[PDB]
Paper text:
Here, we analyze the structure–function relationships in a non-canonical D-amino acid transaminase from Blastococcus saxobsidens, which is active towards D-amino acids and primary (R)-amines. The catalytic unit of a TA is a homodimer with two active sites at the dimer interface, containing PLP covalently bound to the catalytic lysine. The organization of the functional dimer of BlasaTA is typical of PLP fold type IV TAs. We suggest that the features of the active site of transaminase from B. saxobsidens, such as the flexibility of the R34 and R96 residues, the lack of bulky residues in the β-turn at the entrance to the active site, and the short O-pocket loop, facilitate the binding of substrates with and without α-carboxylate groups.
A detailed study of the enzyme includes a kinetic analysis of its substrate scope and a structural analysis of the holoenzyme and its complex with phenylhydrazine—a reversible inhibitor and analogue of (R)-1-phenylethylamine—a benchmark substrate of (R)-selective amine transaminases. In the complex, the electron density in the active site corresponds to the mixture of the adduct of PLP and phenylhydrazine, mimicking the external aldimine, and an apoform of BlasaTA with equal occupancies. In the structure of the complex with phenylhydrazine, the linkage between phenylhydrazine and PLP is clearly observed in the electron density map, with a dihedral angle C3-C4-C4α-N of about 40°. The pyridine ring of the cofactor is tilted by 12° around the N1-C6 bond from its position in the holoenzyme. The released ε-NH2 group of K155 forms a hydrogen bond with the N4′ atom of the adduct. Notably, the accommodation of the phenyl ring in the O-pocket is accompanied by the formation of stacking interactions with the side chain of F39 and the removal of the side chains of residues R96 and R34* from the active site. The orientation of the D105* and D121 residues is slightly changed, resulting in the shortening of the distance between the oxygen atoms of γ-carboxylate groups from 12.3 Å in the holoenzyme to 11.00 Å in the complex. The RMSD for the Cα atoms between the subunits of the holoenzyme and the complex did not exceed 0.2 Å, indicating no gross structural changes upon substrate binding. The reaction between the PLP form of BlasaTA and phenylhydrazine was limited to the formation of the external aldimine (transimination step), whose accumulation was observed at 370 nm. According to the analysis of the crystal structures of the holoenzyme and the complex with phenylhydrazine, an analogue of the substrate (R)-1-phenylethylamine, the active site of BlasaTA, shares common features with another non-canonical DAAT of expanded substrate specificity from C. pusillum.
Residue numbers in the entry:
A (entry chain A), B (entry chain A): 4 to 281
Amino acid sequence: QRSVAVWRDGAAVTVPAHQPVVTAFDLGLGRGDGIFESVAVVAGRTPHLAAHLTRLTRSAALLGLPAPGDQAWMEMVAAVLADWPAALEGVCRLFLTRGLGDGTPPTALALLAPVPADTLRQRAEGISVATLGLGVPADFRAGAPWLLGGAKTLSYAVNMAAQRHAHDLGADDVVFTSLEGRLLEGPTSTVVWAAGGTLHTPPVETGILPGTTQARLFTAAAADGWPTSVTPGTVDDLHAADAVWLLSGVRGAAVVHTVDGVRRGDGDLSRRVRELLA
Amino acid sequence: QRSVAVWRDGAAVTVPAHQPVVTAFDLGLGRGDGIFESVAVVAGRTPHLAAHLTRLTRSAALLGLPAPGDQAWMEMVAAVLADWPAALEGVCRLFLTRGLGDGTPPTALALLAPVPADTLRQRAEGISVATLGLGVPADFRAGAPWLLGGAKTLSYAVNMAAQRHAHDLGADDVVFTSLEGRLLEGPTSTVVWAAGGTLHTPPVETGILPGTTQARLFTAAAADGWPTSVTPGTVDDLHAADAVWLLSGVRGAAVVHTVDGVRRGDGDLSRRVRELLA
Ligand SMILES: Cc1ncc(COP(=O)(O)O)c(/C=N/Nc2ccccc2)c1O
Ligand SMILES: Cc1ncc(COP(=O)(O)O)c(/C=N/Nc2ccccc2)c1O
């Protein structure tokens, strides 16, 4: 099952999941002019909701979208959670669109659906990843705010086409690379790798998204005496690593067992990552 | 006024413009995973509909979207035109989204609204343009189909943020540039410029959109003995030109009187461009 709530006249309103909620002129539909956050629902609860709401706020600020505020979002999360089975892991997406235009109200929605079995299987069994160039220099987006580098938008056509291109090659997912071959991130994930006793992730001064699963791992790793580093790594670094993972809010930690058709092990490092994230 | 038609059970169905038509799970909303075309409505007619439908077909093919076919689109255009005032110039947008997922039907819509007075004023009086880098090499997108270079998508968040960035600077519109400073195109237009008795436009092997207003100008220019060229121009070329225009289906030909705050004339070349486009 699926469930949806719309923000109407300062209240969360539950509507049937198959009921249309956005008109033809919504700029989130026609232009992809809006932001989202994907919130894991585990045993009927949203363990990391606050983290996601801080990122929703930053995404909304990058796009100059008026945001309804935390109270509002928590009320819409409550609405869609109301009849949700504790046994069924969910993805609760929050969408904010520019609506019919700035001046008129932005459209706020919450939508909840099961995490798919194939996403669960990838968390359990790991993934193959294709590296695909984005064409941009690593330092470019820092000087080009119009490219929306640190924002999570409704404009994911490229993200989806990258994933289809990867599926066509026989891979499960994508890591983007800069022009010079620097790691950036997934269409939908943050890369992390283990090397020389350290956990590495690429810098986001490169204009990628401050991943919340990754932040939570690095904080717990720090506390457990596992050194962490922001490292301007390349695909060479992924091949040479002791282990590689894609981190995301919904899939969680997916070990990367294949990079560009090159099979790799994890040096049995995945267990401590999973313990720290738990 | 505005009007909308949805494709339901092999028929065009008229619905009130304020009526929701897309559910929360439509991938055109949540992911910007769909295509569009914007069709000028002039004196209650769609003079260039066939041209736009051929481009809709190519966009749909780049995204691997099943397309309903020309018959269907012409029926949805007929539906929204039904009560439309001949005196009111319109923009008829056709949207095709991946729907709830491939396997399930794509969502097809037509939506018709007046061309705004400020767009009409720009056609009459011309525009200021900001050049903004896209960060990509001119030759990059040709080797990177996942970047969707020659497709017109529902994923226009960057396009819109570029335009807002330009408005903030005091400009009306944008021309994108490659890393090396080559002209690409507008978020929503094709650049053309006059130099040395020739009409120039940038190559689209660079992964930009084959503009239909531009094709129509170059065809009529050819027939009238005005030489045309595909020219790998830079911003230098826009400053040095005898005249510069942005061409698009809805605004038409907008003379560019200012490039990056540098004012320019058109050498009285705009009249012959407008005669040829008429
Ligand atoms: C570009 C990009 N980079 C990183 C993450 C890692 O973030 P976190 O640990 O907070 O999830 C995401 C995920 N978005 N979430 C998402 C995207 C698409 C579909 C569903 C969810 C992303 O989209
Ligand atoms: C990237 C890009 N490049 C060129 C044109 C020139 O094409 P044509 O002469 O066929 O119009 C368009 C226009 N889209 N149309 C459009 C875009 C946004 C909003 C409304 C219409 C465009 O979006």
